[PDB]
């Protein structure tokens, strides 16, 4: 899991050219993630290695197994110049050799990251859903005068490129979600878009299981407990499984609302599908308060235990 950062004295040049290349649909191959990290070390740290090595961003990516490698080259203005000299970067070298690159203003890194952040809220549902959402949200930020993206970023062709970059990059998505959740005033104006989108990504693909959980929990004199019917012998397997799945999620700590968007490990058994008895009981309990667990279909053989949970939540 080696990630190459690029280190030059004209970082802003180098960076905006990586953005040009991403916007042009050029495939950076294995240099993608270290391209995108290299960006990020600017919107947040001026290419200062020392300030980056102390951030909670760097600690998490190391705790996740990443190790950063560095291309020191001081005297070079083009992204072209920082690509290592290997046959396997030839077709990338070729594409970069011919690419468009206008003079680049500094809002642009930030502007780019803000735009990527708009795909998060529905990323896990697929391209169509991530793109229609992001397009509705461009309308809100444009209308607020917060930003106007270039009009050509708003085509489905361009948007598909960006969505695929997001699916492809763990690091990109994580920088966004972290800086998202730790914003107060932000690094700059582009940061509050990121936070707002990231706020709307919270429990994406974890909302139904989250709800089922909520409704199998009861208040008591002696603290918060599981509901009595959950602690019976017919539910013992499901409870043990659910708990192990739930314990896997809680390893992700503050990033656990974003586990599925980040594809974090150990959440494969958090489908509410797998716990039909627990789904029934949450339903029973929800209906008495009186929610409708939307997406929780209660199969017909578990209907009695739903009733049991409902009748006894009123009692």
């Amino acid at each position: 899991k080696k990630v190459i950062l690029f280190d030059t004295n004209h970082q802003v040049s180098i960076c905006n050219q990586i953005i040009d290349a991403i916007n042009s649909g050029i495939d950076l191959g294995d240099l993608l993630e270290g391209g995108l990290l290299t960006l990020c070390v600017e919107h947040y740290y001026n290419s200062d290695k020392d300030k980056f090595n102390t951030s909670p961003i760097a600690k998490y990516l190391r705790d996740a197994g990443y190790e950063f490698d560095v291309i020191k080259n001081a005297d070079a203005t083009r992204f072209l110049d920082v690509i290592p000299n290997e046959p396997h970067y030839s077709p990338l070298i070729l594409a970069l050799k011919t690419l468009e690159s206008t003079e680049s203003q500094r809002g642009r890194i930030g502007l780019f990251l803000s735009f990527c952040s708009l795909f998060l809220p529905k990323l896990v549902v697929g391209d169509r859903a991530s793109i229609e959402k992001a397009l509705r949200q461009v309308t809100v930020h444009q209308e607020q005068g917060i930003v106007t993206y270039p009009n050509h970023w708003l085509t489905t062709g361009h948007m598909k490129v960006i969505f695929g970059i997001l699916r492809s990059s763990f690091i990109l998505k994580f920088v966004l979600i972290h800086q998202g959740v730790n914003l107060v005033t932000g690094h700059d104006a582009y940061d509050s878009i990121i936070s707002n989108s990231v706020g709307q990504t919270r429990f994406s693909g974890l909302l139904i299981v989250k709800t089922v959980l909520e409704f199998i929990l009861q208040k008591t004199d002696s603290g918060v407990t599981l509901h009595p019917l959950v602690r019976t012998s017919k539910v013992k397997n499901e409870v043990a499984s659910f708990k192990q799945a739930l314990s896997n999620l809680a390893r992700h700590g503050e990033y656990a609302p974003f586990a599925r968007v980040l594809n974090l490990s150990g959440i494969n058994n958090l489908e509410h599908g797998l716990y039909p008895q627990l789904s029934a009981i949450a339903l029973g309990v929800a209906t008495a308060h009186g929610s409708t667990l939307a997406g929780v279909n209660v199969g017909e053989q578990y209907q009695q235990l739903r009733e049991a949970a409902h009748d006894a939540e009123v009692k």
Binding site: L206, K210, L213, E214, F215, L217, Q218, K219, G223, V224, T225, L226, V239, K243, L246, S247, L249, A250, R251, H252, G253, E254, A256, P257, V285, A288, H289, E313
Partner: peptide
């Protein structure tokens, strides 16, 4: 079930704020 402060609990179980086996047993 009440208070809709359950959401605070349930989310805490999910982000490791509320110890799990306190609710679910060892």
């Amino acid at each position: 079930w009440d208070s809709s402060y359950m959401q605070q609990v349930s989310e805490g179980l999910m982000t490791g704020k509320v110890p799990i086996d306190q609710v679910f047993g060892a």
